[PDB]
Symmetry: D2
């Protein structure tokens, strides 16, 4: 029964063609949904009660579109998101962090606009986790956004939105200085021929997967759901194909910001992503990611590939990793393990930000500290296990891979352990 679920006959196929032939509509997904959902906040999704339903439906990142609304409007949206998120903090083993992303208005006819400088400063003052920078055309646009965030916004992730021909042509220099990329298909489909957008999307997703940096697929994914309760056949296919392409995140804009079915749109993206993740051909994907990733002398990078290889060898239910900044979890995520990456962290911001990386399930550690560091590490690992049991990730008898470091502080991950549950 285990080998009939989660498209396991298709996963064991020797060729991609045979993998397709073995896909089964009766093979139910069992793993937790790994592709994060970004929902745009607006009039249809601003109330605290509506936001609680969206969190339950699967929203991981709340997007605030600074192209519309005042600073007062966006501050109220942030407060409502935080109130809805903290309403579930009473059960720390099931609490779900939700990131807050600021999407800039853009340069317009201009580099960095004066309104963007003010909006970026608002973001730093209100503690946003991510910036989706509109119309990034070159590396200096990213440096300008970074400078506008100042010293107090050093930890904010900058996701560059590629929306025109120049952004596509200068992609390599933009990705090098960005934390990740958004394939902003709305403007891209107006700036370049509509029939070429899929090429730009597939290329950028492939390059981001190669670089190990998050990539978001955005705009008109479930467009018809703005007025209709069910999406079109092209819309469900688009969501599934963005996941199969290798996108870390999928997004909803008008579907959640102004549409009549914001919760249903989140539920639909969740349902499709789960089905598409099980249909991923890990046999070739892992082989290619492994082969393309360069040789490294960084112990976090070396431990990460060793841990993902170990996870596939034993069909590990999860890889539990301790992380301060999210980096050790990101390096595991880049190899696309089938095992869920359960990231235990004390940083509330890192817990929100790792939603950008596919297959990373953040757990915010709020248990009392231990006097001996080795005991404190072990307790964080046991917390990962208990949260995993409660959420359905783990059961007694499962094998897990545990990734830790040799001393406190970020940058010292160097250990991988094979543990039997209970």
């Amino acid at each position: 029964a285990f080998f009939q679920q989660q498209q396991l006959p298709a996963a064991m196929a020797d060729t991609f063609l045979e993998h397709l032939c073995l896909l089964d509509i009766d093979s139910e997904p069992v793993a937790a949904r790994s592709t994060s959902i970004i929902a745009t906040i607006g009039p249809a999704s601003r109330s605290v009660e509506r936001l609680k339903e969206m969190i339950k439906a699967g929203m991981n990142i709340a997007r605030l579109n600074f192209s519309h609304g005042s600073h007062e409007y966006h501050a109220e949206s942030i407060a409502n998101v935080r109130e809805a998120v903290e309403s579930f903090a009473g059960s720390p083993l099931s609490y779900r962090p939700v990131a807050i992303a600021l999407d800039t208005k853009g340069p317009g006819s201009g580099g960095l606009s004066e309104q963007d400088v003010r909006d970026l400063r608002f973001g730093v003052e209100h503690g946003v986790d991510i910036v989706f920078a509109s119309f990034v055309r070159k590396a200096s646009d990213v440096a300008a956004v970074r400078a506008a965030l100042g010293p107090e916004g050093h930890g904010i992730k900058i996701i560059s939105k590629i929306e025109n021909h120049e952004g596509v042509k200068r992609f390599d220099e933009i990705l090098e200085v960005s934390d990740g990329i958004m394939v902003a298909r709305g403007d891209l489909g107006i700036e370049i021929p509509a029939e070429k957008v899929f090429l730009a999307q597939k290329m950028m997703i492939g390059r981001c997967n190669l670089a190990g940096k998050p990539v978001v697929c955005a705009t008109q994914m479930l467009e018809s759901m703005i007025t209709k309760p069910r999406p079109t056949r092209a819309e469900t296919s688009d969501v599934a194909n963005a996941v199969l392409d290798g996108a870390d995140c999928i997004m909803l804009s008008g579907e959640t910001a102004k549409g009549n079915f914001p919760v249903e749109a989140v539920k639909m993206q969740h349902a499709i992503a789960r089905e598409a993740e099980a249909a991923v051909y890990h046999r070739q994907l892992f082989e290619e990611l492994r082969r393309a990733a360069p040789l490294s002398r960084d112990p976090t990078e070396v431990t990460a590939i060793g841990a993902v290889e170990a996870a596939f060898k034993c069909c590990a239910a999860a890889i539990i990793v301790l992380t301060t900044t999210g980096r050790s979890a990101q390096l595991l995520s880049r190899y696309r393990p089938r095992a869920a990456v359960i990231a235990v962290t004390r940083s509330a911001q890192a817990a929100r930000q790792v939603h950008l990386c596919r297959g990373v399930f953040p757990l915010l550690y709020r248990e009392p500290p231990e006097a001996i560091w080795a005991d404190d590490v072990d307790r964080r690992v046991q917390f990962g296990i208990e949260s995993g049991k409660l959420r359905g990730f783990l059961r007694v008898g499962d094998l897990v891979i545990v990734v830790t470091g040799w001393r406190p502080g970020s940058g010292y991950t160097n250990i991988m352990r094979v543990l039997s549950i209970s």
Copy 2:
């Protein structure tokens, strides 16, 4: 010999990649498609696309197959649609560069436990009006196909039956249905109501893969460019859906309300044409050919053996085309199953085979009407040169190009056993 400009077009840097991941990383929006569009477009005929003048514009835009939806309209209404399609197609007989065959497909209303009384009458109408294809609605098992085959009376055994898979039972009994069908249609409209909407992509990808493995045509259908019923431009999900159906391996793509009742029927056909051309150049032939080759069983059938040899030869020299002589379309279908990058130019004397081969990806039919030569080898040579000269006229070929030519050792269908490498003079 060919130049650096040649190797920058049609996604050739992405085509030469050693891994699928590197192939994706090398896809270039500035690399323009050069090859003729190989995925056929099926357009549904209705009030928005019925007039002879509108049909001429749809043929020019790229429509290869006209679909008549027998769920609506009388026999008199459909007979007039057939006459208007034939009048629009024959209006281009004066120009060899613009004349192109267009198949006529009858889509049945559907079942009741099996074949309905209306379907028996509509299938009889199809035989009497010389339709080329039947898109059989709600096929659930092999006996449904046998009932459609029996209803095609004594005169319609040459009509192709494309089984529409629209429910859970059709998906589960897919192998037995494909075995007795000429091809399959992934009818996503009803499929998305009969099974959970989030599972349709799995059924589509599975059925396309199995049809590619069997070497039988597969159609992707319904809501591909839905928003174009009222809007002049499609959504980002719609262009992605069309491109991904081609990348999945679909032989044909379809338009329903977009061309039958919408405000932009011609623009919807133009959009499918533009996307299909871009997506065909983005196909990773290096792995696709290797897997089709490895999965296809060993064969002692000379047509099957010649076809793989010809496709291998075409890839070796970057052949501009594979010219094949075919009476039933079968030799062209066996070339098409290996997905060559070279266009398969099929020269035939059968008007029906010329229309029907539009079901097979990459097959460009040429109807030959010259009087037969007394010496059979001379008649073969005349047809081969007719393919070469039509290719030069349409932009497929130029002097100095290499072409692969597929023929048999004697007249009559079933004897394909020869592959030749020719330099165009």
Copy 3:
């Protein structure tokens, strides 16, 4: 039948990985195909008798090597005459006649920088006596090959030059030497004295790989069955060395003292024949063909394009043979470079090309002696039938087998362009 798929290591051939291929090798799986790696036997006092030479031809000797490091011109002229008398004693039965090439192995430069005066005289002797091949000793650079070619003069343009790589400089300048040579000999005797003995296997494997990539013949030579100079059976290391030279990709294997001066010349030829047949069935064609195909560059030469198409067609139908008509041997060499499992039966009127194609693995030359038919198409068909009738008599073919036939569109060398699937009747 199941019995067919148990022989010639077919379970090991169908394996998905090289490791599983090794695990499936079976000592009870008997070889069925004809031995494809040519045997070169050095002529000397143990192998000069016309009667002894007839036994060596029957045992499998394909090329007779004359070592010009020993003996006078009178001694070598007598060896040539005895070889030709033994070879022509079988010419009365043209369907079974086996051509045998004559190769002249030069003394070398000695302490000199280039072509020695003795080599100039020996090369002129070779041209005057009609030798087919020259094994040029101690080739260190491209200009050494040009000097050998100039010493052969205008009458020796058809002689094949196989460069012997015997020292560090020859290994380092391998690419420039191979470019101007017809092929290479890994002359392990001197190589194992010029470079550390423990590094010879690296030079052998590298040169064989580069010759296979270039599609040019490579010979593995020296001490392959050394102990058989005095003992009736070879050592375990010797049988392993012969098998591994075949698995490495060598076109030819050689015997020196084993046939020139030893007590078991015929048994040494029989031993190389037996090992080579076993090792050829153990070749993992699944990966080898894929890699040769992928590494071979794109080509606009129709002979090259027809050759890959024919080898692909042969693997698709498990063809017993590829019958090719050839004037110079080139069309057979281009088929041989893809290492088909099917025997390449090369039918030629050139007695010299029939002898020289033994340098290419898997090429079985048939010398056609009939004068040309008045109708060229009939002359082509008669030669193909001669290939089939010889193939039946020799055990290559049976009624019911499929064969690939490779021909050209006009008389004369350089116009091969046709591949055809034929059933043996």
Copy 4:
């Protein structure tokens, strides 16, 4: 180039020219062959063990010290000839030569002692002489038995029973020497610790032209099973009288290593020949060249793909450690082992990194020479009070011994494999350490 560019700038172009690294980075086996270079020098320690047969040419203590220095890892006693008194003296001379280097625990070289049985002869099973010779082996503490003419699983059970309760730790390597042994290979390997391709008798029992098929098949199946396989007989035969081997002999040694053999053997070459030390030196030189020419890219991929999924933590840690070692070009994998099993499971994936096995068992240190790429270090210190400190001391002993021996350099990365509790069977940890 992008997959090695950062490491090329850091380690240098000279690093990537040695140990056949251009051939190792090739995308196909054909390109790997084309890139093999006679000027690319081997850098790694020799991983394929050398078994030398002891006889009149190699019996003296002084000659044995030279053979240990030349690279002999296993001493073979052929019980087809000589009395029990003769073999006991050979064992004592081997032990005296081995213990002459014990003064420096950081360098000492353990040498295994293997007893090769006379065989069944015309009998159907275990002979009476074999029962007595096997009891002699247990009494004299031999590490391995090379069991002659194994034809079925019951033959190895008979050898195991003849070793008694005191010989439970002795490794049984079954010699496959006839058609029945080849046909019943799977049942024999299942109950054996390893296999010897005994080509001498095999080449007489089956056609000589088929021996290479049996050798390649048995090596492949042993590699798949993760059990040691020995290639034996006439590898350097001409060196019995000549100082240099033939071209076929060097090729045979190189191809046995490329086939996947864990051990290579010398019989008359060391037992009675005029050049026993030179024969060991020649096998050492060829094995190092051939090990660098192994195409690890496909070999590791195929071993990984063919090995079934496992829930054994030692097996899971081993694959993770070998993958980590390839990712960083690790100089070594240091493993703590009681029985040798954790080192054997690392060895089955054929890492390029040396497997330095730290053990307190003198017998396990001798026996791990059967596994390719395992370098045994015998730890003699008494246990620390805190188990975690004792584990750390053993890891540091491996690192310090490794640096002092040129296996590790400052700046190198090493992978360290340990367990969560004392005793055999609990290996479950992999660590990445930087050498300072």
